[PDB]
Amino acid sequence: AFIILDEVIKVTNRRVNAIEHVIIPRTENTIAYINSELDELDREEFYRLKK
């Protein structure tokens, strides 16, 4: 049981760092760029319609 816990501790320590490292930046940058493009893309039709 000690060899199994010592074997699983490295995989949990690797997955805990990789899952926290690779998770946030792609969805954060893609969501911020998608909302940033969707804001001006939504406002441009209202500005052209008002003009």
Partner: protein, 593 residues
């Protein structure tokens, strides 16, 4: 004819204009600046000014030429630099003493101070002629005459008088056409508008192989004679290196260079680098600059030359394809012409579509993409020609979701990839299967793979290993290398070696030379045999470090193979790639036992 009523921004208003057409080229004011009629409302016509001017008074007269803006078609285009408005840059550089376009100038459409040798073809007195037939030829190159003397389109009749061989000028007439009386005389040079596409005899399928000269381009998805290709990417991907390497290493009869707005150093580096290099198609005495036409467009140049540069280059490429020679058009890039059209649409006050770009960009790009292609040459002789247009695209804000890249990638049939992470390793442009595809790769691999080549099996296995290399790198980065096997490490090393040897174009000792499909077939067969021997050798018991150290000088010799010149003992097979199969078999046999 007309009078300027008001000037607001880059657009001017001219009243008393009832004979001006749509897109007609005229001169506004006393500066003689280039302009065109974009819209008209009643007696006052709106004329957009593309050249920079800060001395245009309100009330100056506008002189219309009476026809739309186009380019001249005749002998004298090769070995000379011209702008998008059909203006000579060498005469403005020698006379005005300025390399760039000054604020207000006026010159002819072509060089009228250089005589050419005009020779008569197979025509005679009393024979019928038509628009597109080879009425003669003009000696311009040492190998063959590139400027073919042809009649203008939409013209026919009988040849009443044929001029003899000798030296003459473009202004002097040497041909007379008799059709329903005295119609008019013909000269050595002819005019054609840039807003009207030239006609053709008949269209043909694009299934002929086009030797671009790039091992990475022809190795993954080689283009065909008469197709369309798009290449996206940010700044620093190697568009001028692929244009100069595709123009110099190309085997076509003519090269069409179209600059739609650059920094300025790339046009002088490509123009000075074009005649300083040696062509690999059996030519000398400036073979790259003699058969290549350079269109000089800067970033601060006029919008009429940048917007009409693709129409002038497509018209000159259509005239060179109609003359009977195969021409390859390399343009970089359409993002400056789309940004100039969006700037003209924003200054004109029209309704845009998205991000300031107009809705007519899809029809304008569809007209230029439809005007190019492979087909039969127009004329009584029925010659064979081709027009291969390769234009790269760029984003407007850093994203590839713009309408220019989406419309150019959607309307095109061949795509060229580009990796930002692979471009940092000096491998730009690097793409194998993830960012590029080709519909004509099956017919090109079937036609070129008939007698000499065996590219389809190594290209299919290399495309499968290149597609699995992304999942192996993502699984190795996400989970780790403990769950992966030796086959994923051997395929990852083979994908890095094939990507570094094929995607890499910049050397460390000198510039890369031309490489045919037979030279890249030995490297792809050596990489497929090394990956198959490495994967099959690990099944019977073998270490990965023993096989990777057992490779040794094969990776260093495979990297320096592109720097050497071709024809070192054979044209289809090389002696350097033959030792890698015996060394891989000896290392695979020694690694097993």
């Amino acid at each position: 004819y007309g009078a300027i009523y008001s000037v607001s921004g880059p657009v001017v208003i001219a009243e008393n204009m009832i004979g001006c057409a749509m897109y007609e080229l005229v001169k506004v004011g006393h500066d003689n600046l280039v302009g065109e009629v974009i819209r008209i409302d009643g007696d006052k016509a709106t004329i957009q000014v593309y050249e920079e001017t800060a001395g245009l008074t309100v009330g100056d007269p506008v002189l219309r030429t009476g026809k739309p803006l186009s380019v001249e078609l005749g002998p004298g285009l090769m070995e000379t630099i011209y702008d998008g408005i059909q203006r000579p840059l060498k005469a403005i550089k020698e006379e005005s003493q300025s390399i760039y376009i000054p604020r207000g100038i006026d010159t002819p459409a072509l060089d009228r101070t250089i005589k050419w040798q005009f020779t008569p073809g197979k025509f005679q007195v009393g024979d019928h002629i038509s628009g597109g037939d080879i009425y003669g030829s003009v000696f311009e190159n040492s190998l063959i005459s590139s400027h073919k003397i042809l009649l203008p389109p939409r013209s026919r009749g009988t040849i009443t008088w044929i001029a003899p061989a000798g030296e003459y000028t473009l202004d002097e007439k040497i041909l007379e056409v008799e059709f329903d009386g005295k119609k008019s005389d013909f000269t050595l040079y002819h005019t054609w508008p840039v807003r009207v596409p030239r006609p053709v005899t008949e269209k043909l399928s694009a299934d002929y192989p086009l030797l671009t000269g790039q091992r990475v381009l022809d190795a993954l998805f080689p283009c065909v004679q008469g197709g369309t290709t798009c290449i996206p990417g940010a700044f620093g991907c190697g568009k001028t290196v692929i244009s100069q390497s595709l123009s110099k290493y190309s085997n076509s009869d003519a090269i069409i260079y179209v600059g739609c707005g650059e920094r300025g150093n790339e046009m002088a580096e490509v123009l000075m680098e074009f005649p300083e290099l040696y062509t690999e198609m059996s030519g000398t005495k400036e073979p790259i600059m003699k058969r290549t036409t350079l269109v000089a467009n800067t970033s601060n140049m006029p919008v009429a030359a940048r917007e009409a540069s693709i129409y002038t280059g497509i018209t000159l490429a259509e005239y060179f394809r109609d003359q009977g020679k195969n021409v390859s058009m390399i343009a970089d890039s359409s993002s400056r012409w789309a940004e100039a059209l969006r700037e003209i649409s924003g200054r004109l006050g029209e309704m845009p579509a998205d991000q300031g770009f107009p809705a007519y960009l899809g029809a304008k790009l569809a007209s230029f993409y439809e005007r190019a292609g492979k087909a039969v040459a127009l004329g009584s002789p029925d010659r064979t020609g081709s027009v291969s247009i390769v234009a790269a695209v760029s984003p407007a804000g850093g994203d590839f979701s713009d309408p220019v890249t989406t419309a150019t990638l959607g309307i095109t049939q061949v795509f060229w990839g580009l990796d930002k992470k692979l471009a940092q390793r000096k491998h730009f442009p690097s793409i194998n299967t993830s960012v590029s595809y080709s519909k004509y790769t099956n017919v090109l691999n079937k036609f070129y793979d008939s007698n000499y080549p065996e590219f389809p099996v190594l290209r299919d296995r290399m495309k499968e290993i290149l597609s699995n290399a992304e999942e192996l790198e993502q699984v190795v980065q996400l989970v780790g290398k403990s769950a992966l096997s030796d086959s994923d490490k051997i395929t990852l090393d083979v994908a890095t070696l094939i990507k570094e040897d094929f995607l890499q174009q910049n050397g460390y000792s000198t510039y890369d030379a031309f490489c045919p499909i037979w030279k890249t077939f030995d490297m792809m067969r050596a990489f497929i045999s090394y990956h198959d021997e490495a994967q099959k050798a690990v099944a019977n018991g073998a270490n990965w470090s023993k096989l990777a150290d057992s490779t040794g000088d094969v990776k260093h010799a495979v990297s320096s193979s592109k720097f050497f010149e071709p024809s070192r003992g054979e044209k289809e097979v090389h002696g350097e790639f033959e030792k890698l199969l015996s060394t891989m078999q000896e290392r695979f046999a020694e690694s097993t036992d």
